[PDB]
Design a protein around this nucleic acid. Structure first.
Ligand SMILES: [Zn+2]
Ligand SMILES: [Zn+2]
Ligand SMILES: [Zn+2]
Ligand SMILES: [Zn+2]
Lengths: 816, 84, 211, 174, 103
RNA sequence: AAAAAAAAAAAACUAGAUACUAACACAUUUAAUUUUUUUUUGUU
């Protein structure tokens, strides 16, 4: 007791620490559980742990921490009794319905692990009494749970269970949820339903004919999910169910006719061209009859059938313009549509899919009246449709008149906008990019509007004003007005001192698009005055300002190195080297990219001293990014400049400077692909000391050098240095820790292609069997990787003689 | 922990794709069978090493040597030759 | 579990077989592989619990030294290490390509070598370099000061060679005043040993040019 | 933490150390050369010295060291300080011990160049040693001068033929 | 992936369709996460394409993908190119713990 | 007078001290599409 009650205390203290505890506390207690999970009784682990998850006081944060523990224990113990299976399904099962897909996925990993742990037989015995439940919620849950189990264990093993529930005459809800299981199985497997669809079809067909309507509807939705997930192939099976859908459509009306038209509508694109024409023309009558249906469901289905039928070749586009289209636009573009999003998406996408058959000028023609409507959120939807339609079809169809009215409505609806959205930018941009040469007579007022909007007091309208310039700059070059480029660039450079960062970044982006396009010498400010006004901006903190500023400065580094004096460039370097403490990634990547531009601009040796001075800092981001910077400098200005300086720097006694030296060398090797050959020979005595050194970090990082060196230096004909390097590596095979061992293994694999498969194998065959169960476990891994890289390449190299193995091969000893 | 548990999984996958991969304990027979299959596949695959085996064995046709090599991959093929 | 004496009898090179090789699952096969032609044995730091490196050997290792070719480039004086650069790009580019084209490390390693913990290459290279320069018949000035043997004076063992004869392993060794003229003794040398194209000769050597 | 002391690197080829063990290797980390331990910070070092294993290694080094390692005569008159500097040290620490003489063979010298003669070395705690070359194989080497009285002092030489005027600080030897 | 162990790839027979990367993961080898020197386009199996999941990035499988994903030159030299479909399935512990850490 | 032919530390437990690795991840994320769940019950 008192000895084992101490264990009962340890599990409680641990679980407490994970749920409510410090970060470094729970982080270690997780390790303690994962390593000690086998020695604690799963009766005690789950018996203690599960009661926590039932109460309502737990937050999502504290809940996921317990969930993670459940997953880590289940994946280990490997065998579990059925009561705990039922409990874990009671806790984990509700997660599949949760509001956000993260909780869905993490609750899904539980059941997909338990399905393997608990095995096939147990879970099915747990579900059988559950499907019969009178509750709606539980049945809803374990439909999804049952599907997750189905994908996890394969569907065929669980199929006769579904057949039993579906075909069961005993209970009705068993039929219902037994049919829903086919829904979520169809969803999870995706296209992979396919081969199983016949077996699944054993359920649906007869289960469709139940006297109760809510089953008849569920089967209709299953036919839709299977029909869409299948795609064209599945036709041959659905022919058996194709007949009753028609005797169901022509009668039941109401909410059922919606479901059956969803089914048949989803069946259309997989039908042969002969039948497609028939079944479409049959469906279109009911569609037109049902236009006035107030029900959201039925409208949603109508948009589906119109959505699919346009792809059918039988119906002609003239047939659509004469009849279906005008009845479409007037009914489904009513401003009451624009208020609810889920139906907005469907109407817009339906119009877009109709744009293929219909004329582009016809679709856009019907879409100009909604653009000129007064309602703002309605004009927004009217924008979305034009955006996606123009993206697909292009502007080549448009006559000058529609081309004028469209852009007019886009200017108007552009200037009154409220919410922040790119749909105008892209869309109003997608227009410009398409018709750009034809844009010229319209370009003068547009820019003027921008020049007004920049002076507006609201920050959003200033964002949206600056953003639209960056899209126009390329088409403004195509329209040849350079004076407008200069006038813009001047006005932006004057507005460049704005307070609000979110607008200022966009301003600098427009500056970027202007500078890349226009002739460098003709820029008014000019660049030489531009840059010293940029250098204080790098300290603006935030992010977007930093990102856009850095990319722009890099653009200057490419195009205009000679203007700013080298001392100013050094100010830039000292600001960036400080700036890359930023938490964001692209900030650091862009910064490191700019060091190549500056090192090319001014010189390598003035930058390198500054970088190497920064490797003495404790933080890891700084050291690693300065390593990448040294790599890029070595690439752009050549390795012969950087290599002696770095090899000198490696002599320092400090650890972090040495590791940084090795890493910077890794990057500078992977950046120059072929070169790499002249430079080895010098660095093998540098790797000599790295692979020898006591701590496990040098031996790790140096092997990474050996990977990038041996891969692209192979076949060059050195090969006497790689034998040396290998002779230094092989003893490291026994080393533990994940990071060193993966880098060492990668190193041996790279050296396999420098030495060759046989010359590399001569080391391994020895301990490839061996008594020691460990040396064996270590070498079979390298033999695995070598076998994956080489199968017929190792064939001459096996250590096999006629008396070494029983059969051998009699034909290897033949000589002619 | 989780890393090793991925190592086992990729082990099971690559052992399926590439057939023979030694894990830790593999019997000498289990490994020598893989060696035999690789060697025979090289002998048959390259038309060079197939010409060499065909002329050396003096068989009447190339296809006889190739099918001889394929058949040799089954264990019972030795005994089958002995019953002739 | 066949005894290793029974096991060593199967092997053409029985001296490799070890007491633990007896205990393998497949000793007959393992003894055939391990003594097969070119197979190099497993590194020997298994069965040791020291994590393959214990500082006892590692405490006294030298931090690093640049190759003499790179040390010639003068960076050692420019950047101070233990305890603005103004370098010529033509110079550095000539060091790696033109000057150091054929330069290779002094030692490297052979095929069969494997680096065990207590091994140190810095001594072995000094031993090769030792055997190269140090020769019979010659003595350095420092060792002559240690022996108090001025130049032009025969070493003290010359008499025991007069009685007993010349060195056995040095038949061609010529010593002043015995088998070799006494006047030719000068400075540090009192004795001296006095006993193609390989089809691919490149006949032209041209490095890739920078300009 | 370090008490401002400079801990030299292992390779610097030896200012006396406090503890002549803890170093910094070619890398950054701190080492104890006896126990062969790597320490991250000086506090961990102070815990090593205050640890039990380091004591065991110090003792084992202690044992390891403790197991291995009618005629003519001359007369000399050596004079010493006149209460000039000996006024600061009077704590009966061998103060009662008189100067000592020994005959040393030149076969061993700090330079080891020439040799082959003896020296009559004379030593006193503070002052520096003094030597006198004795080419003659034997002089004044008497035969039972006194009547065999056994207070060896240091050796037969010292009692036999030395006088220490401690009141005047004059050491006579003959 | 390379840096994150809990991730599980697909590794099925690559289909005829090219994977896609989000703007954030843009320009990265799906295997070793190397930004430099691309070589070939990735190809994903049927069961990794199907519907909306096809549009997601093949690394983070959250954001929508835009550019085609490339194997770096080294992963083509090692042959890790042709292993199979290099699509990550689960999201990993890091992303989830971020999501619930923030809120 | 002599020579000494080259190997020792632990492990375990429990807590505490401190370096460090992995271009690890860090503000974007939302216009086709599945948590959208009810005893069917919206009429030329
Ligand atoms: Zn110590
Ligand atoms: Zn896939
Ligand atoms: Zn991504
Ligand atoms: Zn790659």
């Amino acid at each position: 007791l008192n000895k084992d009650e101490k264990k009962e205390r340890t599990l409680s203290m641990l679980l407490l620490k994970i749920k409510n505890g410090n970060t470094a506390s729970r982080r270690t207690s997780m390790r303690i559980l994962t390593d000690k999970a086998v020695t604690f009784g799963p009766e005690m682990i789950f018996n203690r742990l599960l009661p926590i998850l039932l109460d309502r006081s737990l937050e999502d944060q504290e809940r996921h921490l317990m969930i993670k523990t459940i997953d880590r224990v289940l994946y280990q113990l490997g065998d579990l009794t059925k009561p705990y299976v039922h409990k874990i399904l009671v806790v984990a099962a509700p997660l599949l319905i949760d509001e956000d897909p993260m909780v869905r996925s993490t609750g899904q990993e539980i059941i997909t692990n338990l399905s393997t742990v608990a095995g096939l037989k147990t879970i099915l015995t747990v579900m059988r009494p559950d499907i019969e439940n009178e509750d709606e919620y539980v049945r809803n849950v374990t439909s999804r749970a049952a599907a997750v189990v189905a994908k996890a264990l394969g569907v065929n093993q669980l199929l006769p269970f579904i057949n039993a529930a579906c075909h069961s005459r005993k209970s009705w809800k068993a039929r219902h949820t037994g049919i829903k299981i086919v829904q979520q199985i169809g969803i999870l497997l995706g296209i992979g339903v396919l081969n199983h669809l016949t077996g699944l079809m054993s359920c649906i067909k007869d289960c469709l004919m139940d006297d109760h309507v809510p089953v008849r509807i569920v089967t209709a939705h299953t036919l839709s999910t299977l029909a869409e997930n299948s795609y064209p192939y599945g036709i041959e099976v659905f022919n058996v169910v194709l007949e009753p859908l028609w005797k169901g459509i022509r009668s039941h009306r109401g909410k059922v006719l919606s479901s059956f038209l969803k089914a048949v509508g989803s069946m259309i694109p997989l039908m042969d061209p002969e039948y497609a024409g028939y079944y479409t023309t049959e469906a279109m009558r009911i569609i037109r009859r049902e236009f006035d249906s107030p029900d959201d469901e039925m409208k949603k289905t109508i948009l589906l059938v119109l959505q699919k039928c346009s792809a059918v070749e039988s119906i002609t586009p003239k047939f659509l313009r004469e009849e279906i289209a005008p009845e479409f636009f007037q009914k489904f573009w009513v401003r009451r549509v624009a208020l609810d999003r889920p139906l907005n998406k469907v109407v817009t996408y339906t119009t877009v899919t109709l744009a293929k058959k219909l004329g582009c000028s016809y679709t856009i023609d019907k879409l100009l009246t909604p653009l000129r409507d007064e309602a703002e959120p309605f004009r927004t939807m009217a924008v979305h449709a034009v955006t996606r339609t123009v993206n697909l079809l292009g502007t080549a169809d448009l006559d000058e008149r529609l081309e004028t009215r469209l852009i007019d409505a886009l200017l108007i609806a552009f200037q009154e906008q409220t919410n922040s959205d790119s749909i105008i930018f892209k869309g109003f941009g997608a227009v410009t990019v398409s018709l750009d040469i034809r844009m010229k007579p319209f370009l003068a007022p547009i820019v003027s509007t921008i020049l007004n909007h920049l002076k507006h007091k609201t920050p959003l309208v200033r964002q949206h004003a600056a953003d639209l310039c960056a899209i126009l700059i390329p088409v403004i070059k195509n329209c040849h007005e350079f004076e407008m480029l200069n006038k813009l660039n001047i006005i932006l450079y004057e507005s460049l001192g704005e307070v609000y960062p979110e607008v200022l970044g966009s301003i600098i982006n427009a500056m970027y698009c202007i500078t890349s396009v226009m002739d460098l010498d003709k820029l008014q400010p000019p660049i030489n005055q531009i840059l010293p006004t940029l250098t204080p901006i790098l300290r603006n903190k935030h992010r977007k300002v930093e990102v856009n500023t850095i990319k722009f400065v890099g653009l200057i580094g490419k195009l205009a190195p000679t203007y700013a004096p080298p001392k100013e460039w050094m100010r830039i370097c000292f600001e960036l080297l400080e700036l890359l403490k930023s938490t964001n990634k692209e900030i650091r990547r862009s910064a490191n990219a700019t060091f190549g531009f500056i090192a090319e601009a001014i010189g390598p040796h003035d930058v390198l001293v500054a970088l190497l001075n920064n490797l003495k800092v404790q933080e890891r981001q700084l050291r690693v990014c300065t390593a990448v910077a040294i790599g890029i400098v070595a690439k752009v200005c050549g390795p012969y400049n950087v290599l002696p300086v770095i090899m000198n720097e490696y002599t320092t006694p400090e650890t972090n400077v040495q590791n940084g030296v090795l890493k910077a060398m890794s990057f500078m090797f992977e950046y120059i692909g072929n070169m790499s050959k002249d430079y080895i020979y010098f660095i093998t005595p540098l790797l000599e000391d790295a692979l020898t050194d006591r701590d496990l970090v040098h031996r790790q990082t140096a092997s990474n050098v050996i990977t990038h060196l041996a891969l692209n230096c192979s076949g060059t004909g050195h090969e006497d240095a790689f034998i040396h390097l290998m002779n230094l590596l092989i003893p490291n095979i026994f080393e533990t820790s994940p990071h060193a061992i993966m880098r060492i293994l990668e190193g041996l694999e790279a050296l396999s292609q420098a030495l060759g498969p046989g010359l590399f194998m001569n080391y391994i065959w020895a301990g490839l069997f061996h008594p020691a169960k460990n040396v064996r476990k270590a070498f079979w891994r390298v033999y695995n990787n070598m076998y994956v890289m080489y199968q017929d390449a190792m064939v001459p190299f096996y250590p096999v003689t006629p008396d070494n193995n029983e059969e051998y091969i009699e034909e290897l000893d033949l000589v002619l | 922990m989780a890393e090793k548990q991925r190592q086992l999984k990729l082990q099971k996958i690559y052992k399926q794709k590439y057939i023979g991969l030694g894990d830790e304990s593999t019997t000498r027979e289990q490994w020598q069978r893989n060696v035999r299959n690789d060697t025979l596949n090289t002998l048959q695959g390259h038309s060079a090493s197939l010409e060499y085996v065909s002329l050396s064995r003096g068989d009447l046709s190339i296809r006889d040597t190739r099918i001889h090599l394929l058949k040799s991959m089954s264990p019972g093929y030795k005994a089958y030759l002995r019953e002739e | 579990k066949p005894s290793l004496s029974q096991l060593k009898s199967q092997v053409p090179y029985p001296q490799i077989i070890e007491w633990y090789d007896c205990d393998a699952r497949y000793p007959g096969l393992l003894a055939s592989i391990k003594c097969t032609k070119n197979v190099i044995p497993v590194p020997s730091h298994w069965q040791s619990k020291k994590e393959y490196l214990s500082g006892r050997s590692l405490l006294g290792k030298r931090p690093f030294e640049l190759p003499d070719i790179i040390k010639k480039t003068n960076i050692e004086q420019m950047r101070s290490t233990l305890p603005a650069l103004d370098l010529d790009y033509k110079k550095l580019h000539d060091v790696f390509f033109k000057i150091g084209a054929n330069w290779k490390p002094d030692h490297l390693l052979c095929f069969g070598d494997v680096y065990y913990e207590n091994r140190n290459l810095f001594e072995e290279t000094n031993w090769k370099r030792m055997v190269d320069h140090k020769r019979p018949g010659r003595i350095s000035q420092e060792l002559r000061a240690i022996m108090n043997l001025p130049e032009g004076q025969l070493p003290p063992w010359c008499m025991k060679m007069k009685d007993i004869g010349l060195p056995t392993g040095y038949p061609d060794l010529k010593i002043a005043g015995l088998n070799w003229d006494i006047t030719n003794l000068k400075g540090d040398v009192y004795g001296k040993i006095i006993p193609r194209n390989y089809f691919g000769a490149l006949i032209s050597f041209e490095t890739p040019e920078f300009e | 933490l370090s008490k401002g002391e400079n801990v030299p690197y292992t390779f610097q080829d030896e200012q006396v150390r406090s503890n002549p063990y803890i170093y910094k290797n070619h890398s950054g980390k701190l080492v104890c050369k006896l126990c062969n331990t790597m320490h991250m910070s000086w506090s961990s070092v102070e815990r090593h010295l205050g640890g039990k294993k380091h004591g065991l290694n110090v003792l084992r080094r202690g044992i390891s060291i403790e197991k291995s390692s009618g005629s003519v005569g001359l007369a000399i008159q050596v004079n010493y300080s006149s209460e000039v500097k000996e006024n600061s040290v009077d704590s009966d620490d061998k103060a009662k011990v008189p100067p000592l003489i020994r005959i040393v063979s030149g076969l061993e010298l700090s330079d080891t160049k020439q040799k082959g003669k003896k020296f009559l070395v004379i030593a006193y705690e503070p002052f520096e040693n003094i030597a006198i070359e004795l080419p003659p194989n034997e002089i004044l080497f008497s035969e039972n001068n006194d009547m065999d009285n056994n207070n060896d002092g240091v050796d037969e030489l010292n009692k036999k033929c030395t006088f220490w005027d401690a009141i005047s600080k004059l050491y006579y030897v003959q | 992936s390379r840096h994150q162990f809990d991730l599980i790839m697909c590794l099925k027979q690559p289909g005829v369709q090219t994977g896609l990367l989000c703007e954030k993961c843009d320009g990265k080898c799906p295997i070793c996460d190397s930004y430099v020197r691309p070589k070939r386009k990735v190809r994903v199996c049927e069961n990794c394409s199907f519907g909306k999941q096809a549009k997601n990035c093949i690394i983070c499988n959250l954001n929508v993908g835009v550019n085609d994903a490339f194997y770096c030159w080294e992963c083509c030299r090692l042959g890790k190119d042709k292993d199979g479909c290099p699509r990550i399935l689960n999201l990993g512990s890091n992303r989830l713990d971020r999501h619930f850490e923030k809120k």
